[PDB]
Scaffold this active site. Sequence first.
Site, PDB file in Angstrom:
ATOM      1  N   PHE A 129       0.848  -1.193   0.000  1.00 12.90           N
ATOM      2  CA  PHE A 129       0.000   0.000   0.000  1.00 12.90           C
ATOM      3  C   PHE A 129       0.869   1.222   0.000  1.00 12.90           C
ATOM      4  CE2 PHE A 129       0.699  -1.427   4.375  1.00 12.90           C
ATOM      5  CZ  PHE A 129       1.254  -0.313   4.959  1.00 12.90           C
TER       6      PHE A 129
ATOM      7  N   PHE B 182       3.137   3.344   0.659  1.00 10.88           N
ATOM      8  CA  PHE B 182       4.341   3.567   1.467  1.00 10.88           C
ATOM      9  C   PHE B 182       4.625   2.552   2.581  1.00 10.88           C
ATOM     10  CE2 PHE B 182       4.114   6.666  -1.520  1.00 10.88           C
ATOM     11  CZ  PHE B 182       3.330   7.779  -1.227  1.00 10.88           C
TER      12      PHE B 182
HETATM   13 CU1  CUA Z   1       5.182   1.513  -3.505  1.00  5.50          CU
HETATM   14 CU2  CUA Z   1       7.115   2.863  -4.820  1.00  5.50          CU
END
Ligand code: CUA
Lengths: 33, 166, 555
Positions: free
Chosen positions: B84, B86
Amino acid sequence: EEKPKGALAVILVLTLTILVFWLGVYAVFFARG
Amino acid sequence: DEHKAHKAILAYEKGWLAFSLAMLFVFIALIAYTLATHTAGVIPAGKLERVDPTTVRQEGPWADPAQAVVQTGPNQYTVYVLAFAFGYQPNPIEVPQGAEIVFKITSPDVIHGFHVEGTNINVEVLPGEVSTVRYTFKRPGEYRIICNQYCGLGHQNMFGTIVVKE
Amino acid sequence: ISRVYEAYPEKKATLYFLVLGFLALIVGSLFGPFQALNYGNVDAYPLLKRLLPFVQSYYQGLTLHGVLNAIVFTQLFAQAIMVYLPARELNMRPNMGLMWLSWWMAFIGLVVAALPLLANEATVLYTFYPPLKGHWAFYLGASVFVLSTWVSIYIVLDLWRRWKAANPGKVTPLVTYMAVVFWLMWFLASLGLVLEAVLFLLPWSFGLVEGVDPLVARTLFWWTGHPIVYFWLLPAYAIIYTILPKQAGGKLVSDPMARLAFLLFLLLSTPVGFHHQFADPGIDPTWKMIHSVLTLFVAVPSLMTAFTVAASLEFAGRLRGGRGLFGWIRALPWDNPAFVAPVLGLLGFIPGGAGGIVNASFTLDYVVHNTAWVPGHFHLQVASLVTLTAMGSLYWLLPNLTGKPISDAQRRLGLAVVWLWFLGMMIMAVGLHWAGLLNVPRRAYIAQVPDAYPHAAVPMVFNVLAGIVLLVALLLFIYGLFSVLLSRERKPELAEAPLPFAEVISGPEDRRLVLAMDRIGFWFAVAAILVVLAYGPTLVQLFGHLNPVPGWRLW
Ligand code: CUA
Ligand code: HAS
Ligand code: HEM
Ligand SMILES: [Cu+2]
Ligand SMILES: [Xe]
Ligand SMILES: [Xe]
Ligand SMILES: [Xe]
């Protein structure tokens, strides 16, 4: 004149570079398997 | 001279061509070899497995991160992973060595990469689709997951972790 | 105020294409050195941010870099070369109505797409992968920009048909042959992007639909996404086959070998896209294997090329008094940047292609996919061979088009530019490939996470070095380019000179072979069946099970 020695030499280099790259990375692939 | 050169060149040329094709076929064979071994497990599943990225973390195999790992054979564990914006869920992912880990990875937002440092696991993760890859760690320990597909401003910091237990 | 424009008005249109192209190359390439430093673990961006205040992030910069350099510069160069050269060879004039309409399309489309990019509204990189949703004027702008080439296709098809009529039975002349199969190839190729843009991206960014299926979107993209690099390359190949041998003081040693190469590119350039999608789900492994094979075949044309060109340079070298097994190399005109630039290009193109053939080997791709290696690979391909070829060709093309001559000062500044660029690119390529073997992902602001990649300590040095070398080279190129476009020295007689086309050695066995290859309509239809066969099965199955997903802005 005759046989293209220089041309052959160039494609040789090319051939060798392809082989070091390929086999080089083919190595690493198995090392990471 | 010049017309001589011509025949010579075109001669060696066909030589070079036959050689080149030969070497290419050698690669074709060596590839086909890997496809027959265990190492071909990292090749994503071909079958389409559609999911809804907007309900992925509310209902389903990816909802509860405490249900992520699931023993599904005698030596087979399926890990439901979520990449997702980050990060990765679950973090860390904890698995046994010498077992076949089947990853089923998806995304609730955009495209992410799933690159497991030190392995051949390198799969794109698309929203709405499950990326199913198989792999057996041999070596223990701390494997780092790296996002290698631009996902936004926090991309460069998108790391994750595998713990493969001795 | 130019009579030289009035018998050769195609000269002017050509120049506008080139200038617009090099401007784009300058603007995009500014971001280069900073991106190299970034991969050297140095963070130069505040400095950039201070110079160029509109720059909001590393990724906006990389979108500008990719788009202006790899998309804009290369397309405008293709458009200029693969219209002008055939025209001058045939000594015909290109439908000038249409030629100038194609230049406006590209210019309007560029400016329309520039706005949102410059305004941080489209920080989605040059691959613009959904769900990442850019502004509508980015997609509209690009569409118009690319569609410009459809006009160019028409113009060269026209010229061909007209020449065919005035020479019944005659075999298509070499350059015109190249340009015809070139533009037909590009037409086939471009359908993937056009389908993505018309079916998904345009309605999506206008509001009409809320979702887009990521897998089909990038499957269509890479339909076009591979052949497009060949769309970048072949204009440089056209110059290397039919102009370089003359600059080197020799001849093209084979016409039919050159045609074969370009025929093979028409045939195998498009149906290989899954090589870009090895790491994707929902695509059958079998089909990937197939595409991996077709991709190794597409390497054949460039393997041929490497011999033919080498032979022609050896031949040139000998004529010039070429000594032994390496004498010919020293006997070449290293004092002429038109020669030098593409020769160096072709040097770097050896590691370049070797990298590619690695990337093409299905399973091996999992080693390097999305890592610093892939940028390593392509700077040796497009940023070196293609760009050097382009730069070098300034030394004969610019004078031909403008009548401005080239001082000895400029010619030597040229050589400096060319050696630095090449040296800079080689250093970088070691940096990036090394880093890529160490898992360093590409498309990453890694200087912002200094401690993330400690094992890439030494290659990071190389990247820093490259960054510095290439900055200098870029500056000297700007200096040298303007110095040539900003002087008022004008010999109209060199503007009226012929293009330095090379002579071709012919054989007996040519005829039948060349005749078979000239069957363009047949070969076109075969090329198209290949695309249907390679993509048809998969596309039908993706379109049966569409799964659109909403868009996101994450910048
Ligand atoms: Cu997830 Cu770049
Ligand atoms: C213009 C630049 C482009 C060229 C040209 C190019 C060639 C190839 N590539 Fe590629 N590439 C891939 C495979 C190939 C293969 C098989 C070839 C071949 O066409 C190359 C064949 C080349 C040769 C076989 C070399 C011939 C050498 C010659 C001809 C020089 C001879 C020198 C002489 C004669 C001089 C002698 C002089 C003297 C003085 C002696 C793959 C895999 O299948 C990926 C995906 C990787 C991934 O996972 O993301 C990929 C990725 C890319 C990307 C990244 C796209 C992205 O952002 O996602 C770009 C921009 C790119 C560009 C280019 N690439 N490539
Ligand atoms: C000034 C000389 C140049 C330097 C120093 C340079 C450097 C770089 C670096 C370090 C990257 C990696 C960025 C990343 O992955 O985060 C990159 C990306 C790229 N470069 Fe260059 N480059 C230069 C010129 C060019 C040219 C001339 C072209 C094309 C003709 C080009 C095409 C590209 C493309 C297409 C990308 C990837 C864009 C993307 O991944 O979205 N570069 N460049
Ligand atoms: Cu490609
Ligand atoms: Xe587009
Ligand atoms: Xe554009
Ligand atoms: Xe591309």
